[PDB]
RNA sequence: GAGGACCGAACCCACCAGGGUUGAAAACCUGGGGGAUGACCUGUGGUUAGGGGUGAAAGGCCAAUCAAACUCCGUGAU
RNA sequence: UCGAGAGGGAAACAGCCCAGAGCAUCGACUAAGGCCCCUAAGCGUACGCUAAGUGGGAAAGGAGCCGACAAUGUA
RNA sequence: UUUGGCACCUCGUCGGCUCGUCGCAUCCUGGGGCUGGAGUCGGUCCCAAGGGUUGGGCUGUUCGCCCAUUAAAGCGGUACGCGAGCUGGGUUUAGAACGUCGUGAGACAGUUCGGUCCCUAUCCGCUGCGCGCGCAGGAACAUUGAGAAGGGCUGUCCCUAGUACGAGAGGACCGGGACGGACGAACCUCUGGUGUGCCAGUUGUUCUGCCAAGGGCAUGGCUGGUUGGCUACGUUCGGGAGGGAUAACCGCUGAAACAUCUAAGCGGGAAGCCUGCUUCGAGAUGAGUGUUCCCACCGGGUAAGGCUCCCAGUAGACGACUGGGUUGAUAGGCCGGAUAUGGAAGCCCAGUGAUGGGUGGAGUUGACCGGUACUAACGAGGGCUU
């Protein structure tokens, strides 16, 4: 009976999103608003999962920052960043990059997928 | 998510390395402490020669914590480990200098001298 | 638990009377 | 009091972001079209009310007492009725529809519908009792209700004591629910929040009981 | 097919699949079996599903049939004779009949039986 | 290449927990646990008998019974 | 007096008030206690007091009243 | 409610947990009198039991001290509530030791280490669910409400205002907003949890003849993920406002006899009482009300309308409730989607080989979604009186 329940999830739906995948580098545009003055903060790091389903799709990006593993999720379809840089590519074997969280510098890097 | 007998990294300079939240304020019974939620702690491990000695019994905010928190806009903020800084009694922090990332969740509640001495907010 | 007193025969056929077959 | 009232079925929830960039959750209600098919008053019923008829049904699973009900007031046979408590319902008329669009964007709304079953649920599911720990030796009573009454006096189990019985699938109105929009189009309603009932349930709203 | 609510049939998890597997085996090899009226409601989407694999036909999908019906006998006559048969009809290829309870244990019983 | 040596199955035992408690069992089951070349475990054949035996000693054991076994008799004790 | 004592009354209440049961009685008069309804018999007659439901629990003490006050539910 | 006296009934003590329930001699919150009450805060007393009354260290501990908070960390009754509800730490068995007493066996409201806590609910009671009958015609639907249950908690900051008060320090009443703590309900969009379902990797062994590809077992062998469902750590919502009568108390008019809040009257006045909010509710035997349908037959057949049977879930221990039953999308299957995993098998290419690349977001795939009939879908004839 969900019939109509996708046509109320196609007005809200998001088209500027690129199309990426679990172990890509992105650059999103988060959009800071203190106040009066809104800047466009950006956060660069690892794409370690993407779940949901429709508008309620979210994806989380990781990133390590003064030694410390930060991870922000997002919904792929949230009118809070600008856009979305797909950077690199990634030549992982999984769905939900899990195993990130414990691994430190070195050993904790993704790989380019050379064409 | 962090509770009675829950140990905190300290994110400053002020010479603890580790507290023991003891109590959770702002409430009776209440449970747990998140990113902004002052708690107070007594200080586990501390450098040798530091200002605050080890058994003092102290104020802290929290700054980091490893349960993700939801924000308005829809989307979550996690990190590795959970950290506060000590504060003075009058809120102001008791260190110069702030170690690691701060939670943008300290803004709307008045930490602004802890976020200026923050490397970064996210 | 045991039972305290033997049961009369007006409650035990009671009861019985619900341990029937239904006509197919 | 005035209020307002329609029926509506639940479709599911989803999310929608608001001009200051909030998730909203809200949950899509198909409310409409419904129609009037009795209006009761003070002399010919006692109070004053009004029926509205909801629903899709064919012609063939309608009993003739039914279906003679409806030929009053001149409406094709509906599948589920109800009663709206107003006290304007001399304004009414038998036959009126009342569309989707009853309520507008802001407005506070009182849902109502059946919750969903649950079965036969235990002592700690059904009312949130605490448990005799899983360790330091507790025999076969690790989720038991306790204790029930005290001695010889009374020598009872008071009435209304707290047991385990069938939970769930028994009426319930949430309230001040937020009405986020009204998509006239389709005839639907994004409530933020959470509706009872399961989802294809036959939910009730009606304008706000309290604040007014 | 959607999982069972509830017990497995045969005690377990792991005796159901190898129960399910081997009834569709005798279902297949004599085109009808007697069995309780559970199992053969389980036994259903199984065979039904198996005979769908059967009409693609390809080597592939004989690999996939071979995971649950490990005769190759079995699957020789599947995929050369009752595939053929069913090219046409779209689902519904097991026919369900119910019969008197069984004597010793008054187990209702049932007939499943391939649509001809 | 010694050991009342170490780890650890069989074998002997019974420290903890849960189950069992009109039990599958008048003392056991499941998971852990101790010894496991010795003052060790075990089979077969002998032998010590009741105010007596035996006891690395608990009044323990002596046929599901022990601060004095069991059976018959005094005896229909009081 | 009960014990060894039935019957009537005190709501129920061996020991209090009336009264000592051989048996029957679809007659009468009384005892303690009662006579608005429960419940037999007076909304009895006449004079006076009480305003607190006192009657239907209590003290020093204060100006019929206050003092007055525990737990399952009037109690 | 303590320590006791009597010896009238009957030859596991304590502590903790779970679950209550009641009293007010009130810890907080609400109202008020007085104050040696300038203000904030207090002291005492009066009214008030609706709700609330945290977490830890020590000790078996009740108790008590202490730590950190809190609007507050109340006192009691209920077999010092509650072991056919749990524990078994102290205490009242048997072992052993210390101190003391005894010549000795042994003893000690001295101490110390160890030390079996059984039961299938017959009756009442309580929590849920049905069957029968009733309610003078028989039915379908929707409801009034006599009564009953649930809820009643509270903080911080901002404005009013650095204002009235004061030497100043400090610092309001009243009124209006913002966000929370604890508790409860509904729900699964988000976030997390589970997943005997789905996807993939891999170890030992065994099997399908062998290579390749796969199956069985090993806690789902283990490991990495995980839609639906169930969920809280998650989302949303609730406590109210208002109206009536009141407690303490504050008054208007006013005697008995100027004064008197009272003796006649009339007002204000609490988180308390009744309503208002949520839910059950005519077995409310006082069995109600409304709209519609059937129609005035001969113990029996029937009308309106039900029940039984089958497919199921929006339901569920079983009954029961809800929907569908060929005039049919109820379930399965079949087509597609969405989800989940993450790049099938075969073939080709590269490599001595382990392996890698292409064919290709491939193959497999459940619950969520749209289509599609292929499979299975006993019960009226109205008593009398006024």
């Given at each position: 009976m969900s019939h109509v329940l996708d046509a109320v999830?196609?007005?809200?739906?998001?088209?500027?999103v690129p199309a990426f995948r679990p172990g890509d580098t992105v650059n999103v545009h988060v959009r800071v608003i203190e106040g009066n003055r809104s800047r466009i903060q950006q956060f660069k790091g690892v794409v370690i999962r993407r779940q949901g389903s429709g508008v309620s799709e979210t994806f989380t990006v990781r990133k390590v920052s003064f030694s410390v593993g930060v991870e922000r999720t997002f919904?792929?379809?949230?009118?809070?960043?600008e856009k979305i840089e797909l950077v690199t590519r990634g030549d992982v074997r999984?769905?939900?990059?899990?195993?990130?969280?414990?691994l430190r510098g070195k050993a904790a890097k993704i790989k380019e997928k050379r064409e | 998510m962090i509770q009675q007998e829950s140990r905190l990294r300290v994110?400053?300079?002020?010479?603890?390395k580790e507290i023991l939240c003891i109590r959770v304020l702002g409430?009776?019974?209440?449970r747990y402490a998140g990113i902004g939620d002052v708690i107070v702690a007594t200080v586990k491990d501390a450098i040798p020669g530091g200002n605050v000695k080890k058994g003092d019994v102290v104020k802290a905010v929290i700054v980091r914590t490893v349960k993700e928190r939801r924000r308005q806009d829809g989307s979550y903020i996690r990190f590795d480990e959970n950290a506060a800084v000590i504060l003075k009694?009058?809120?102001?922090?008791?260190?110069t200098r702030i170690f690691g990332p701060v939670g943008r969740e300290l803004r709307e509640k008045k930490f602004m001298k802890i976020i200026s001495l923050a490397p970064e907010v996210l | 638990a045991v039972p305290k007193r033997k049961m009369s025969r007006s409650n035990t056929r009671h009861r019985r009377s619900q341990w029937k077959a239904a006509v197919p | 009091k005035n209020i307002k009232g329609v029926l509506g079925e639940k479709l599911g929830m989803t999310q929608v972001w608001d001009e200051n960039n909030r998730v909203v959750p809200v949950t899509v209600v198909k409310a409409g079209p419904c129609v009037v098919t009795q209006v009761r008053s003070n002399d010919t019923d006692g109070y004053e009310s009004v029926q509205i008829a909801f629903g899709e049904i064919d012609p063939?699973?309608?009993?003739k007492p039914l279906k003679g009900h409806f030929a009053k007031a001149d409406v094709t046979p509906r599948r589920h009725l109800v009663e709206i408590r107003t006290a304007?319902?001399?304004?009414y008329t038998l036959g009126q529809e009342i569309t989707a669009a009853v309520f507008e964007a802001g407005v506070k709304v009182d849902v109502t519908g059946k919750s969903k079953g649950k079965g036969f649920a235990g002592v700690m599911k059904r009312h949130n009792f605490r448990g005799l720990?899983?360790?330091?030796g507790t025999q076969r009573k690790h989720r038991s209700p306790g204790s029930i009454g005290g001695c010889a006096t009374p020598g009872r189990v008071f009435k209304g004591l707290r047991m385990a019985g069938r939970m769930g699938n028994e009426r319930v109105t949430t309230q001040?629910?937020?009405?986020?929009?009204?998509?006239?189009e389709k005839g639907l309603l994004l409530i933020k929040g959470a509706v009872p009932g399961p989802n294809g349930g036959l939910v009730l709203v009606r304008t706000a009981a309290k604040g007014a | 097919p959607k999982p069972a609510k509830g017990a497995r049939l045969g005690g377990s998890a792991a005796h159901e699949k190898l129960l399910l597997a081997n009834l569709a085996k005798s279902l297949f090899e004599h085109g009808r079996i007697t069995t309780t009226e559970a199992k053969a409601r389980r036994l259903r989407p199984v065979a039904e599903r198996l005979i769908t694999k059967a009409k693609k036909g390809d080597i592939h999908n004989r690999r996939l049939v071979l995971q649950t019906i490990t005769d190759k006998g079995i699957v020789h006559t599947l995929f050369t004779e009752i595939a053929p048969r069913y090219?046409?009809?779209?689902?519904?290829?097991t026919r369900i009949t119910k019969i008197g309870n069984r004597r010793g244990d008054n187990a209702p019983m049932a007939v499943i039986e391939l649509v001809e």
């Amino acid at each position: 009976m969900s019939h109509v329940l996708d046509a109320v999830n196609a007005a809200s739906l998001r088209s500027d999103v690129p199309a990426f995948r679990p172990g890509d580098t992105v650059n999103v545009h988060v959009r800071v608003i203190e106040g009066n003055r809104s800047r466009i903060q950006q956060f660069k790091g690892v794409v370690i999962r993407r779940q949901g389903s429709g508008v309620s799709e979210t994806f989380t990006v990781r990133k390590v920052s003064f030694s410390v593993g930060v991870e922000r999720t997002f919904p792929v379809h949230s009118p809070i960043f600008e856009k979305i840089e797909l950077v690199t590519r990634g030549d992982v074997r999984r769905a939900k990059l899990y195993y990130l969280r414990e691994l430190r510098g070195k050993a904790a890097k993704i790989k380019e997928k050379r064409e | 998510m962090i509770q009675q007998e829950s140990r905190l990294r300290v994110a400053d300079n002020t010479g603890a390395k580790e507290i023991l939240c003891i109590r959770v304020l702002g409430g009776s019974g209440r449970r747990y402490a998140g990113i902004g939620d002052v708690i107070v702690a007594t200080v586990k491990d501390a450098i040798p020669g530091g200002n605050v000695k080890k058994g003092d019994v102290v104020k802290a905010v929290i700054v980091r914590t490893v349960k993700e928190r939801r924000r308005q806009d829809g989307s979550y903020i996690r990190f590795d480990e959970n950290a506060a800084v000590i504060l003075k009694n009058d809120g102001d922090p008791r260190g110069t200098r702030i170690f690691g990332p701060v939670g943008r969740e300290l803004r709307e509640k008045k930490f602004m001298k802890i976020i200026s001495l923050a490397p970064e907010v996210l | 638990a045991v039972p305290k007193r033997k049961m009369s025969r007006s409650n035990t056929r009671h009861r019985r009377s619900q341990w029937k077959a239904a006509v197919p | 009091k005035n209020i307002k009232g329609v029926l509506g079925e639940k479709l599911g929830m989803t999310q929608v972001w608001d001009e200051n960039n909030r998730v909203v959750p809200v949950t899509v209600v198909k409310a409409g079209p419904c129609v009037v098919t009795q209006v009761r008053s003070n002399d010919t019923d006692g109070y004053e009310s009004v029926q509205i008829a909801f629903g899709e049904i064919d012609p063939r699973k309608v009993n003739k007492p039914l279906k003679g009900h409806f030929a009053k007031a001149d409406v094709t046979p509906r599948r589920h009725l109800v009663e709206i408590r107003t006290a304007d319902a001399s304004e009414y008329t038998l036959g009126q529809e009342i569309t989707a669009a009853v309520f507008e964007a802001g407005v506070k709304v009182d849902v109502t519908g059946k919750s969903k079953g649950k079965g036969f649920a235990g002592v700690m599911k059904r009312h949130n009792f605490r448990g005799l720990g899983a360790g330091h030796g507790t025999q076969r009573k690790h989720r038991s209700p306790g204790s029930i009454g005290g001695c010889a006096t009374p020598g009872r189990v008071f009435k209304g004591l707290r047991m385990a019985g069938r939970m769930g699938n028994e009426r319930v109105t949430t309230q001040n629910l937020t009405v986020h929009a009204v998509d006239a189009e389709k005839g639907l309603l994004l409530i933020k929040g959470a509706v009872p009932g399961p989802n294809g349930g036959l939910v009730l709203v009606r304008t706000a009981a309290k604040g007014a | 097919p959607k999982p069972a609510k509830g017990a497995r049939l045969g005690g377990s998890a792991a005796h159901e699949k190898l129960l399910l597997a081997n009834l569709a085996k005798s279902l297949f090899e004599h085109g009808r079996i007697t069995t309780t009226e559970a199992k053969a409601r389980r036994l259903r989407p199984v065979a039904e599903r198996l005979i769908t694999k059967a009409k693609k036909g390809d080597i592939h999908n004989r690999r996939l049939v071979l995971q649950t019906i490990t005769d190759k006998g079995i699957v020789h006559t599947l995929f050369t004779e009752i595939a053929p048969r069913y090219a046409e009809r779209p689902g519904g290829y097991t026919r369900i009949t119910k019969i008197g309870n069984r004597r010793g244990d008054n187990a209702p019983m049932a007939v499943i039986e391939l649509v001809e």
